[PDB]
Design a protein around this ligand. Structure first.
Ligand SMILES: Nc1ncnc2c1ncn2[C@@H]1O[C@H](COP(=O)(O)OP(=O)(O)OP(=O)(O)O)[C@@H](O)[C@H]1O
Ligand SMILES: [Mg+2]
Lengths: 397, 309, 110, 110
RNA sequence: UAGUCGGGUGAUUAGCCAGACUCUAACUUAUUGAACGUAU
């Protein structure tokens, strides 16, 4: 026993929670809660937490077209460049499956994550017929490393490889158990790919779940396209209450925060509201100085609005104790950032997002040169024109 | 000549009782759990009393070759010798192996004893039955064909050094031609040199040589390769190397030792922490002996000789 | 439903409780249970079962307990494949039974 | 190259793509979409003109929106000439917002 | 710029004072067994 006390008094996180559970079965509870909550306001008026959370390194062995590969990532922004057939989508697919083991263990004790397919993800001519993926995360000077591995063997072979997932369960239990006694702010995870472009209709609703309770924010968050049909239903619920005229916020404040972010980021929308005088409920916007319903917008306009609106709702529900909810921790993945955008909008998208969301880590890809024209040179990674699965490390220009 | 008479003579017993006991020497083990320093358990198995005596006796009758670059489980040497050899070089590399003990089986041993570059001893073909029943563990009761080498048994260290003999022999001779230094502990590999862009090639060379000697049986753990230089932290088997090219206990451990002496000055310390403090000072004297000369200056020699055992 | 599934095939699974309809709206325990007990003559006088569920985001979890029910259904399935026996019946008739009859019985299958 | 093959008692399609052989579900999105346009248009013309020495020389009208979708800069520079070379007698109406596509077309057509 | 090494005060695992260093590039670990340092 004395060994845990000599570690805990030195500032180690995992030894403090071990004493709390063993002795509860109040000195050790406050050490756990303060490590998660401490921070200060900088000279520009932005809140910054004492302990950050992010990904440091990735590695791949006999996976799709790669024999062996390594890559190192930046704490703020990273951008990948190339042509058709070079592996850009296949990298984001490997990261997204790894994050699913955290989300499953915040919702339920002893939950289950996603798998690799034994039919299509193994390399076609590899002699040993199995594949592996490996990662490493950071969470401040209380614990400087957290490792994970996923693996699988080809269809019809006689010997099976195993995964190693326990270190992810150990961290996710601290966030789940401390939050039930007292309250804390929680992290965000999301993926957007090319399945975002789709048509819109009004005759639709879900009879599963409730759209006003805190844990709905994690529902279908790694699926590839956001549930914009849940945003409309939630925004109408806020209206019907506020019309009847600690640190939690009232529906009147929550409604005001979201409307300001939408008008600030999208170049050509200037106001939005709900109305219901005719017998039914509708959403209206002002666009080029004219007045329209959402179904009259062009595809380039609807796609950009749909992305910005869904992220803001999740940020506001998960951080109930901050003064400005858009400043919490998290990780976000986006593929093909210029889909449907005119060349005058393409050259300025990235810097608006980094202004509106100051503490998130972004990972992004593209195949056009105009988007880079304002970025610094330590944020960029690029493939060889000469490669055929030989390049074993990705590098800057 | 044969092992059964040799054991019966050295143990001073009748030889029929040796052959009667050895029939089921596998399965004579006890199993238990020990705690990790952060959270969780490690699982250990140890051989039953009396089977220990046969193992200690066997390692008297025979001897096997060992290369100079090995640093563990050998007499006269220790971890300070491993740390001292790299202390003059400004660049560093490290690597590791999967499941080092459990990966060894009778088929590996009987190949290595035969194909050797060195003077292995001869044996009677019929003694192989008794040799296998002395050296290996059967973990599963129904799968009677599984035999593996346990970490908890007195004979295992010697056998684990012998199996590496040609790997150490070749890789050291290769590094000497290019100004690179090599040493190996139980299962850590360490490389260093004083010129740039030479260390980048090495990981590829190891992976060819491993499958040439062992085939599928042992492999490199890809998740643990690390590079460092004079611009970042450097350590070897728990010992730190400073920018003045000398060995160190590190600032954080030095400051923690100062606190415990200050508790003793005012009589606030108690018997458990007093015993622990004496054990640390006995260790610290071997690695950084100039530290004690400063401690009996910041505190009186009068107080220091009272604390000392 | 747990007896019927185990007579037909080895392993198998029954039905389960629903998290958004069945749990009482304001109970501070945040979980719900249903419990039963059967009899099968002087040599096997008790067979208990429990079904359970709990709300999402809690510190702990509740599971079901069904092993004593699987054990009895395996005896009926194993003996019958060696030499034939009689088997039990289970049924439910609801208010939804009153509906019109379709005279075109053209459908055929084997 | 492209061909039909049989495995495990089932028929399936193979292609050779930059040096290697794959199934259709392994292609990138910029490769699939471009294949899907050309394969559909060729069938319909082969079925409708049975009495020409080359079925692809018949007549009609085709509409296309957003030619630049999923194509990188070196391909979107040249797509128009390859289409017009393969279907000599069709009338085309096309739309875009990228000025690279226009860099090889005469001023009357705009 | 920011990281890393550590001589000195300091009821001392904190804070503060002084002086140094950069190959894309450290993350402190396990007994009752084996080897080593110190008692007996
Ligand atoms: N199992 C496999 N074995 C070998 N090659 C494969 C395998 N699976 C896919 N490929 C190769 O993967 C490449 C496409 O990879 P991916 O779709 O990730 O690249 P991408 O072009 O950058 O994607 P995108 O631009 O749409 O984001 C193709 O060249 C294809 O031949
Ligand atoms: Mg000991």
């Amino acid at each position: 026993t004395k060994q845990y006390e000599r570690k805990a008094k030195g500032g180690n996180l995992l030894s403090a929670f071990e004493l709390y559970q063993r002795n509860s079965d109040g000195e050790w509870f406050e050490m756990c809660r303060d490590y998660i909550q401490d921070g200060h306001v900088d000279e520009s008026g932005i809140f910054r937490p004492d302990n950050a959370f992010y990904l440091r390194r990735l590695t791949l062995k006999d996976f799709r077209r790669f024999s062996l590969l390594e890559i190192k990532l930046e704490e703020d922004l990273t951008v990948i460049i190339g042509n058709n057939g070079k592996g850009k989508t296949s990298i984001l697919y490997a990261i997204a499956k790894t994050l699913s083991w955290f989300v499953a263990n915040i919702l339920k004790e002893g939950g289950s994550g996603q798998r690799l397919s034994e039919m299509t993800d193994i390399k076609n001519d590899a002699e040993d017929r199995y594949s592996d993926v490996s990662s490493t995360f950071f969470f401040g000077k209380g614990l400087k490393s957290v490792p994970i591995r996923l693996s699988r063997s080809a269809l019809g072979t006689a010997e099976r490889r195993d995964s190693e997932v326990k270190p992810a369960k150990d961290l996710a239990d601290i966030w789940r158990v401390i939050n039930e006694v007292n309250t804390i702010n929680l992290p965000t995870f999301a993926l957007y790919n090319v399945e975002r472009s789709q048509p819109f209709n009004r005759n639709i609703k879900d009879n599963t779940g409730r759209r006003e309770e805190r844990f709905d924010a994690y529902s279908q968050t790694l699926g590839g396209a956001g549930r914009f049909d849940h945003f409309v239903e939630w925004y109408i619920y806020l209206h019907k209450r506020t019309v009847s005229d600690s640190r939690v916020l009232t529906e009147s404040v929550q409604k005001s925060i979201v409307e300001k972010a939408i008008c600030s980021v999208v170049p050509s929308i200037s106001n939005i509201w709900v109305e219901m005088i005719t017998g039914s409920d509708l959403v209206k916007v002002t666009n080029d100085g004219h007045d329209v319903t959402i179904d009259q917008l062009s595809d380039g306009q609807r796609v950009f609005l749909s992305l910005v609106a869904d992220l803001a709702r999740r940020m506001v529900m998960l951080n109930p104790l901050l003064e400005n909810p858009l400043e919490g921790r998290g990780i976000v993945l986006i593929d093909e950032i210029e889909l449907h955008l005119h060349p005058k909008w393409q050259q300025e998208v990235i810097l608006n997002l980094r202004s509106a969301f100051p503490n998130i880590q972004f990972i992004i890809t593209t195949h056009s040169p105009i988007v880079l024209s304002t970025i610094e040179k330590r944020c960029i990674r690029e493939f060889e024109p000469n490669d055929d699965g030989d390049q074993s490390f990705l590098d800057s220009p | 000549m044969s092992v059964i008479r040799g054991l019966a003579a050295v143990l001073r017993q009748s030889d029929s009782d040796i052959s009667a006991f050895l029939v089921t020497a596998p399965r004579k083990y006890k199993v238990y759990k020990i705690p990790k320093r952060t959270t969780g358990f490690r699982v250990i198995a140890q051989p039953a009393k009396g089977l220990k005596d046969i193992q200690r006796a066997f390692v008297q009758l025979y001897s096997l070759p060992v290369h100079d670059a090995s640093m563990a489980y050998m007499k006269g040497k220790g971890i300070r010798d491993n740390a001292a050899a790299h202390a003059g070089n400004q660049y560093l590399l490290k690597a590791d192996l999967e499941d080092f003990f459990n990966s060894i089986t009778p088929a590996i041993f009987w190949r290595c004893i035969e194909m050797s570059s060195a003077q292995t001893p001869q044996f009677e073909p019929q003694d192989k039955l008794f040799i296998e029943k002395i050296l290996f563990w059967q973990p599963i009761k129904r799968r009677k064909t599984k035999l593996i080498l346990s970490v908890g048994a007195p004979s295992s260290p010697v056998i684990s050094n012998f199996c590496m003999y040609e790997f150490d022999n070749r890789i050291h001779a290769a590094c000497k031609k290019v100004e690179i230094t090599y040493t190996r502990y139980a299962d850590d590999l360490t490389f260093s040199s004083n010129i740039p862009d030479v260390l980048k090639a090495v990981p590829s060379t190891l992976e060819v040589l491993l499958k040439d000697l062992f085939g599928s049986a042992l492999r490199l753990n890809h998740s643990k390769t690390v590079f460092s230089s004079k611009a970042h932290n450097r350590h070897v088997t728990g010992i730190t190397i400073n920018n003045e090219e000398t060995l160190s206990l590190g600032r954080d451990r030095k400051r923690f030792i100062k606190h415990l002496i200050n508790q003793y000055k005012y009589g606030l310390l108690d018997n458990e922490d007093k015993a622990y403090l004496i054990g640390l000072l006995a260790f610290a004297s071997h690695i950084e002996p100039s530290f004690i000369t400063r401690m009996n200056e910041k505190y009186s020699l009068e107080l220091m000789e009272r604390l000392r055992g």
